C-alpha cells in the first residue's frame, strides 16, 4: 500500500496544469509508495475559499499540499502553513519574504530582469505592470532606478476596466508619448500582455524603434507571431528549454496525448506553470522517498482535527516534511531544481530570448550566480 | 435589555483606540438598545489569527464587527465578510477595490495628496514609502507622474530593523545628498514619521530649503514642535478639526478621563485612528437605531453556526444591516460622515496644514468635488 495523502488546490480553468499534474503522477509513480491526491478546484483569489479548502485537506489528514495562490490569497496560505507546519508546494509567484513551509517551484525573475535591462543599456523606459504577483518587482526596479539614475515611468495597468477599456489605452499612450517612450517592460498577467500587445499593434507602436521586454518566465507560452513582423524588438525569458533532451522527450509524449483526456495537452509547448506543476510531483515524490530512505516515520497517529483548534499545536512531523522537500535536488522540465532554507529556487538558469522574423531565439542565459551570459 | 451584540477586533497595542471605543459606547448608548461588544485582542497581521477571531465572533452571533486589518490580513476580512454578509466597520486603510460588507471610516488620502503636490508646483521630489504599511498611494503618484510631469525618487523606508535605524535613516538622507533632493514626501505611520523627523533634525535637514509633506491624516497627532523652528516647510493633512465645537466639547471630556481607566486618553489631541473609532460607534448605533425606526427585524433566530460550514449560505438580514450602515449620515470627530454604496467616505473634508513658528495652521481644505481650496 504505502498510500501518502496529499492535497491539490487548483484554480478553476487551470486545465493544462492539472493535466501536467496527472502526467506527473503517472511518470513518477513507483511501487515504493503512492501519492494519493485529494483535489479541490476553486477560485484562488477568494481567501474564504482557499481557507475552506486548506482546512478541509488539513482535517482529512494530508501530508503536504500542492497548489496555487494569488496576491489576494498568499497570506492565507503562508499564515495557515506556517502556523500548522503544513508544507505548501506551489508554482505561483515566490512569496515576498522567508515564510517557512512554502516550497516555491517558480524561480525569482527580478535579477534576470534587472540584468537584461542593463544588458540593453536602458536608462529610461516604461514599466507597465499589474499586481497579481505582488509588487516586489516594482520595488526592485524603483530601487535600481534611484541607484543607477534611470528615468522609469511606472504605471499600474491592472485596473483598466475591460468594460470600457479603450479610452483608457489612448490616455495611457498619451502619457507615454509625453516623453516619447519607446522602451517598454510588460510585467502583467498573461491575458493582460496580450491585450496590451493588440493595443500596441493597433496604434502602430509595434514597428522599428520600439522595444518590449515581456517580464515573465514563458516568452513562447503565448502568441508572438502577431508582433513578429512589425519591426519592434521583443525580448523575454524562458525557464523551459525545448532543446534539453529531457524536455524534448516529454514534449514528444505531451504533444500526442489525447486532448479530451488531457485538456491543454496536445501541443508543442507547455506553459511554464504547467511544467512547474509536473516538476512539483517529482519533488514531492523525492521528498517522501528520502524520508523513507532515512527511516523517518511521519505517519499520523491521530486525526489532524480542526484547522481552527485553539491552541494551534503543530504536528511534530511537520518540520521533518518541510526539510525533506527543501533538500530535494533533481532535474526537471524547468532545469536544475534546488532550494534554499526558505524554499526558494537556487542554482537555476533562465534563458534570455529575442523575437526574430524566423521565430523566438535564445541569445543567452541568466545564471542564479553568474548573471547574464551571451551565447556565441 | 435590548442587547445587540457586536464584535471588536483590536490590534494588540491599540490602547487609545480601545479607550476611544469605550468612550463612544458611553456617549451614544441609549434606552432603546445597548451595543454589547465582544472584544478580541490579536496579532492583526496574522491571517490565521484574524480568521480565528472572525470565526469566533461569527459563531457567537454578532450582528456586525468593528475592527482593524493589516495589508496582510485585509483579504481575509473582505473575503469572509463578503461571503457571509457580515459587516465589518473599520478605521483602517480603505480597501483597494469595491469590496462589499466593509464600512470604511477612513477617507481616501490620495486625491488631497496629489492635489497638494500640484499646489506647491513640485516637479521633482523624493517619496519615502513604508512597504510594511502599503504601496497604494505611492502607486497613485507613480501613475500620475507622467501626466503631471513629475520626477519621483521612491525610497522604501519599510524594512528597517530597529537595531540600526539611526544609521539607516542617516544613510538614506546622506544619499539623497546626491541628486540634491530637498522636497520629500513621508507617507508613514505617525511613529515612523517621528523617527524620521528625529533623524532629519539630527542631520540638520530641517532647515530652510527643505520641504516635507507628511502623507497621513493626522498632521498634529505627533510632535511637530521639535521641527518647528528649523526653517523647513512641513505640510500635512488633518481630518479631526479641533476648532469644531463637537470636537472641542469631546476633548474637554477626553482630557479629563483618568489615564488608568482610559489608556491614551488624558491628552489634548487624539490620533485620527481613535477619532474614527469613536465615530464608528456612532455609525453603528445610528444604523441599528434606523433599522428599528423602519421595523426591519434583524434578530437572528438560529445560531450563526461555523464560519466553515459548507455550503456557505449567508443570512438573509446581512444585506439590510449593510445597507443601514451605509445609509447613516452623521457629523462626528472626523467631520461629516457619509458613505457610498461601497462603504467609502463621501462628501468628507481634509484640512491642509503647514507648520509655522506659532504652530500648525490650517491653510485650506480638500473636498471630493472642489479639490484643493486655499483658506481666507
Ligand atoms: C532594437 O535593437 C536594436 C539592435 O540592437 C537596437 O539598435 C542598436 O542599439 C544602439 C543604440 O541605439 C545603436 O547605436 C546600434 O547601432 C544598434 N545596432 C544595430 C546594428 O542596429 C535598438 O536600440 C533597439 N530598439 C530600441 C528602441 O531600443
Ligand atoms: C517653502 O515654501 C515657500 C512658499 O510656498 C516656497 O516658495 C517661496 O515662495 C515663492 C513662491 O515660489 C518663491 O519665489 C520663494 O523663493 C520661496 N521662498 C523662499 C525664501 O524660498 C519655497 O520654495 C519652499 N521651500 C521648498 C524647498 O520647497
Swiss-Prot record, chains A, B:
It comes from the Eukaryota. Palmitoylated. Depalmitoylated upon L-glutamate stimulation. Ubiquitinated by RNF167, leading to its degradation. Disulfide bonds join 55-307. It is found in: Cell membrane; Postsynaptic cell membrane; Postsynaptic density membrane. Glycans are attached at residues 233, 347. Residues 1-376 are extracellular. Induction: Down-regulated in the pyramidal cell layer of CA1 in the hippocampus by global ischemia. Detected in forebrain. Detected in dendrites of neuronal cells. Expressed in the pyramidal cell layers of CA1 and CA3 and in the granule cell layer of the dentate gyrus. Ionotropic glutamate receptor that functions as a ligand-gated cation channel, gated by L-glutamate and glutamatergic agonists such as alpha-amino-3-hydroxy-5-methyl-4-isoxazolepropionic acid (AMPA), quisqualic acid, and kainic acid. L-glutamate acts as an excitatory neurotransmitter at many synapses in the central nervous system and plays an important role in fast excitatory synaptic transmission. Homotetramer or heterotetramer of pore-forming glutamate receptor subunits. Tetramers may be formed by the dimerization of dimers. May interact with MPP4. Forms a ternary complex with GRIP1 and CSPG4. Interacts with ATAD1 in an ATP-dependent manner. ATAD1-catalyzed ATP hydrolysis disrupts binding to ATAD1 and to GRIP1 and leads to AMPAR complex disassembly. Interacts with GRIP2. Interacts with GRIP1. Interacts with NSF via its C-terminus. Interacts with CACNG2, PICK1 and GRIP2. Interacts with GRIA1 and SYNDIG1. Part of a complex containing GRIA2, NSF and NAPA and/or NAPB. The M4 transmembrane segment mediates tetramerization and is required for cell surface expression. Belongs to the glutamate-gated ion channel (TC 1.A.10.1) family. GRIA2 subfamily. This is Glutamate receptor 2. It comes from Rattus norvegicus (Rat).
